[PDB]
Design an enzyme around this catalytic site. Structure first.
Site, PDB file in Angstrom:
ATOM      1  N   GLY A  59       7.206   0.873  -5.511  1.00  0.00           N
ATOM      2  CA  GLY A  59       6.811   1.706  -4.380  1.00  0.00           C
ATOM      3  C   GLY A  59       6.906   3.149  -4.816  1.00  0.00           C
ATOM      4  O   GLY A  59       7.349   3.447  -5.922  1.00  0.00           O
ATOM      5  N   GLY A  62      10.754   4.552  -5.711  1.00  0.00           N
ATOM      6  CA  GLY A  62      11.754   3.478  -5.753  1.00  0.00           C
ATOM      7  C   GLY A  62      11.154   2.094  -5.919  1.00  0.00           C
ATOM      8  O   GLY A  62       9.933   1.900  -5.791  1.00  0.00           O
ATOM      9  N   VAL A  64      10.782  -2.042  -4.978  1.00  0.00           N
ATOM     10  CA  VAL A  64      10.715  -2.887  -3.792  1.00  0.00           C
ATOM     11  C   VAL A  64      11.238  -4.299  -4.075  1.00  0.00           C
ATOM     12  O   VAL A  64      10.924  -4.889  -5.105  1.00  0.00           O
ATOM     13  CB  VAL A  64       9.277  -2.957  -3.249  1.00  0.00           C
ATOM     14  CG1 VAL A  64       9.227  -3.777  -1.971  1.00  0.00           C
ATOM     15  CG2 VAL A  64       8.748  -1.555  -3.004  1.00  0.00           C
ATOM     16  N   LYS A  79      12.655  -1.075   0.139  1.00  0.00           N
ATOM     17  CA  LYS A  79      12.507  -0.095  -0.932  1.00  0.00           C
ATOM     18  C   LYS A  79      13.733   0.781  -0.957  1.00  0.00           C
ATOM     19  O   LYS A  79      14.089   1.407   0.049  1.00  0.00           O
ATOM     20  CB  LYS A  79      11.244   0.755  -0.789  1.00  0.00           C
ATOM     21  CG  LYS A  79      10.974   1.635  -2.005  1.00  0.00           C
ATOM     22  CD  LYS A  79       9.655   2.382  -1.881  1.00  0.00           C
ATOM     23  CE  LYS A  79       9.704   3.433  -0.782  1.00  0.00           C
ATOM     24  NZ  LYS A  79       8.640   4.452  -0.947  1.00  0.00           N
ATOM     25  N   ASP A 165      -1.522   8.056  -0.784  1.00  0.00           N
ATOM     26  CA  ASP A 165      -1.626   7.268  -2.015  1.00  0.00           C
ATOM     27  C   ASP A 165      -2.237   5.901  -1.798  1.00  0.00           C
ATOM     28  O   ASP A 165      -1.603   4.880  -2.061  1.00  0.00           O
ATOM     29  CB  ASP A 165      -0.284   7.156  -2.747  1.00  0.00           C
ATOM     30  CG  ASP A 165      -0.453   6.889  -4.245  1.00  0.00           C
ATOM     31  OD1 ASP A 165      -1.540   7.146  -4.792  1.00  0.00           O
ATOM     32  OD2 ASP A 165       0.506   6.416  -4.882  1.00  0.00           O
TER      33      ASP A 165
HETATM   34  O1  LIG Z   1       7.460   2.356   1.351  1.00  0.00           O
HETATM   35  C1  LIG Z   1       8.109   1.173   1.512  1.00  0.00           C
HETATM   36  C2  LIG Z   1       9.083   1.043   2.497  1.00  0.00           C
HETATM   37  C3  LIG Z   1       9.737  -0.165   2.659  1.00  0.00           C
HETATM   38  C4  LIG Z   1       9.425  -1.237   1.829  1.00  0.00           C
HETATM   39  F1  LIG Z   1      10.073  -2.412   1.985  1.00  0.00           F
HETATM   40  C5  LIG Z   1       8.457  -1.110   0.842  1.00  0.00           C
HETATM   41  C6  LIG Z   1       7.781   0.097   0.680  1.00  0.00           C
HETATM   42  N1  LIG Z   1       6.793   0.307  -0.301  1.00  0.00           N
HETATM   43  C7  LIG Z   1       6.012  -0.648  -0.941  1.00  0.00           C
HETATM   44  N2  LIG Z   1       6.088  -1.934  -0.836  1.00  0.00           N
HETATM   45  C8  LIG Z   1       5.211  -2.636  -1.558  1.00  0.00           C
HETATM   46  C9  LIG Z   1       5.197  -4.106  -1.542  1.00  0.00           C
HETATM   47  C10 LIG Z   1       5.864  -4.823  -0.535  1.00  0.00           C
HETATM   48  C11 LIG Z   1       5.829  -6.206  -0.568  1.00  0.00           C
HETATM   49  N3  LIG Z   1       5.182  -6.833  -1.545  1.00  0.00           N
HETATM   50  C12 LIG Z   1       4.546  -6.190  -2.513  1.00  0.00           C
HETATM   51  C13 LIG Z   1       4.525  -4.807  -2.551  1.00  0.00           C
HETATM   52  C14 LIG Z   1       4.360  -1.932  -2.331  1.00  0.00           C
HETATM   53  S1  LIG Z   1       4.725  -0.242  -2.075  1.00  0.00           S
END
Ligand SMILES: Oc1ccc(F)cc1Nc1nc(-c2ccncc2)cs1
Length: 312
Positions: A59, A62, A64, A79, A165
């Site tokens: 992410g 950070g 994930v 994240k 992004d």
């Molecule tokens: O900004 C966040 C805030 C809380 C989160 F739990 C995750 C993110 N960011 C991202 N999560 C993913 C992802 C999630 C689940 N599976 C595949 C990719 C890709 S970027």
């Protein structure tokens, strides 16, 4: 003891504003769903919740992970972001927003110099993971997903929120791949812009001009090229600092697959106009992409099953 509580989006945002020396065990935050439960006003990793399995992906700022609340057993995504690179915009931009095209946040909880952001876990994986697994995606499915992404952008832009992004790695799919939704607002801006992925960056970004919602459009069309070709734009033609090439080269329309139908190529062209003033809005592009999808005969390709060789 600490200050982790159950509440609504605005109460989270207010506290997140205070997050912006020594390293503490301060535990505070707001959980937004009853499925994640604070225990005596605490919520601490390894005690009340735990990560497991391999990483889900990267992410902004950070990593994930899959996580589990030890009491309720409920599974979601987290994240983990170091406090000094945590952007407030990630928890403010989407407070009071709700869309099928936007992956809902479950809350956030700070633990010393770490901020843990909780989000719904969609079992389809990321669009980025889909591309890697399949090589590249067929035209109809790529249009279908761009359409859905663009619907998410409409919803944001009419609220003067820039995602910041837009890329396959920040798009999640549902378990049958029929639904795509935007996630990760680490680079979001409420219309100083912290630039996203270099390959997806608009000329006005590298030029340091005032950025508007059109930045997301460019990025989304870069994502379209990634789905179609199996690789980020620029990377197969150019060696190092893509900054200058984005600012000085023609927009990467040469990267549109020759096989794409007229309206598909048109949409991508209009989403990739160098001057934001001429670039299509999310509303405009979503309509064109919709027409484009009809003209190739609608969504027909199964979401998996056939590996398609990317661009060499
Ligand atoms: O900004 C966040 C805030 C809380 C989160 F739990 C995750 C993110 N960011 C991202 N999560 C993913 C992802 C999630 C689940 N599976 C595949 C990719 C890709 S970027």
């Amino acid at each position: 003891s600490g200050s982790v509580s159950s509440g609504q989006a605005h109460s989270l945002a207010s506290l997140a504003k205070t997050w912006s020396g020594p390293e503490t065990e301060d535990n505070e935050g707001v959980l937004l769903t009853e499925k994640l439960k604070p225990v005596d006003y605490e919520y601490r990793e390894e005690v009340h919740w735990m990560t497991h399995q391999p990483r889900l992906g990267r992410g902004s700022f950070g990593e994930v992970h899959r996580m589990k609340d030890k009491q309720t057993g409920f599974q979601c995504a987290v994240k983990k972001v170091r406090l000094e690179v945590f952007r407030v915009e990630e928890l403010v931009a989407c407070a009071g927003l709700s869309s099928p095209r936007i992956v809902p946040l479950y809350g956030a909880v700070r633990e010393g110099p770490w901020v843990n952001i909780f989000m719904e876990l969609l079992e389809g994986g990321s669009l980025g993971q889909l591309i890697k697994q399949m090589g590249c995606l067929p035209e109809d499915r790529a249009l279908y997903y761009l359409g859905q992404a663009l619907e998410g952008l409409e919803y944001l832009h009419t609220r003067r929120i820039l995602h910041g992004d837009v890329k396959a790695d920040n798009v999640l799919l549902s378990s049958d791949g029929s639904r795509a939704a935007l996630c990760d607002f680490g680079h979001a801006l409420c219309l100083d812009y912290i630039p996203g992925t270099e390959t997806h960056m608009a000329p006005e970004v590298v030029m340091g001009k005032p950025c508007d919602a059109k930045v997301d459009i460019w990025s989304s069309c870069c994502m379209m090229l990634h789905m179609l070709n199996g690789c980020h734009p620029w990377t197969q033609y150019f060696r190092g600092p893509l900054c200058l090439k984005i600012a000085s080269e023609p927009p990467p329309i040469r990267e549109i697959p020759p096989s794409c139908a007229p309206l598909t190529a048109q949409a991508i062209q209009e989403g990739l106009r160098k001057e934001p003033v001429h670039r299509a809005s999310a509303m405009e592009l979503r309509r064109k992409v919709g027409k484009a999808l009809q003209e190739v005969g609608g969504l027909k390709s199964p979401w998996k099953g056939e590996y398609k060789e990317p661009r060499g």
